[PDB]
Design a protein around this ligand. Structure first.
Ligand SMILES: [Cl-]
Ligand SMILES: [Cl-]
Ligand SMILES: [Cl-]
Ligand SMILES: [Mg+2]
Ligand SMILES: [Mg+2]
Lengths: 67, 67, 67, 67, 67, 67
């Protein structure tokens, strides 16, 4: 278990690979979408591809509130 | 509009105020919960309180992927 | 209103687009310059281009102090 | 020199100490204010105090753009 | 497995609890120390305490380079 | 001196340059490896290259704990 309190299960619905990073779009429950930019190495290692079941993890101090 | 692509609508179900920061917990669609730690100053200025409808925003580079 | 307490108005003076991300340079008051790396999708969506008036937003917990 | 491309000189106009963190407010050129939340331990070691001339540093990937 | 490429095993040598967050200090291989500020809720749930063997994880986009 | 409490001295053992960003892999004491994604401008400016002695700097609120 990791300290990051946001752990949202999702399915990949978009993937764009660059040279250093890749953009991963996950659909999570309720139809929300989360977009992640991570290293291309991690995409490759985790075998990220359309339909993959993965979890989006965000540290609490990175979540802003919009009112 | 802001460049942060993740905007998750939610309702505050928990709030703990510290001296410098506060922890806000939002229930989002599908029952997922998002936890945010922001400055106490912002909580006050945005009038964040239990039950409030608000939106969590996260920059894509802050979203990690777990497999 | 967003919780991020740093909101600096600026004008775009530099833009470099990659495949996933783009680098945006804003000149803010007093001659300071802020450089941002964000998703290319956002640049495109916000119509970022030289001279555009935009605001740089930074969460407090991301600001370091150098003495 | 550090890779963080944003280095903004300023003067501390506010300081609030908590137990683990502290909020530092710096006035920068043009009157902009930058707000930083850092560890209390750092405030102590860098001798951060009201009126001190200090520099705020932000990594480019933490700067969002608002339009 | 998670996309965050940096995973550093360590032993807790310091722990300071606040109301919202907690500061965890880990000694890692070679004697380097890593300092983490996470939510108090997580410290409790992961049962973080002095002497515990734990792993520090950091997303690559959060590591700055200083020369 | 900078407020970020993690300052890990290391040597570059991997470098991959993209158009906006670059991935830098540093070996630090004890054989630990740190991977950083930073702006290509900074890579160029700091003259990052294999064997360079540099320091990985991470803010405490970016360090997660895995148990
Ligand atoms: Cl967290
Ligand atoms: Cl903030
Ligand atoms: Cl820090
Ligand atoms: Mg952060
Ligand atoms: Mg970040």
């Amino acid at each position: 278990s990791i300290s990051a309190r946001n752990q949202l299960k999702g399915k990949v619905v978009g993937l764009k690979k660059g040279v250093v990073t890749a953009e991963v779009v996950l659909e999570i429950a309720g139809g929300n979408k989360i977009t992640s930019i991570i290293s291309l190495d991690s995409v490759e290692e985790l075998g990220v591809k359309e339909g993959a079941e993965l979890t989006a993890v965000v540290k609490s101090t990175d979540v802003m509130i919009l009112a």
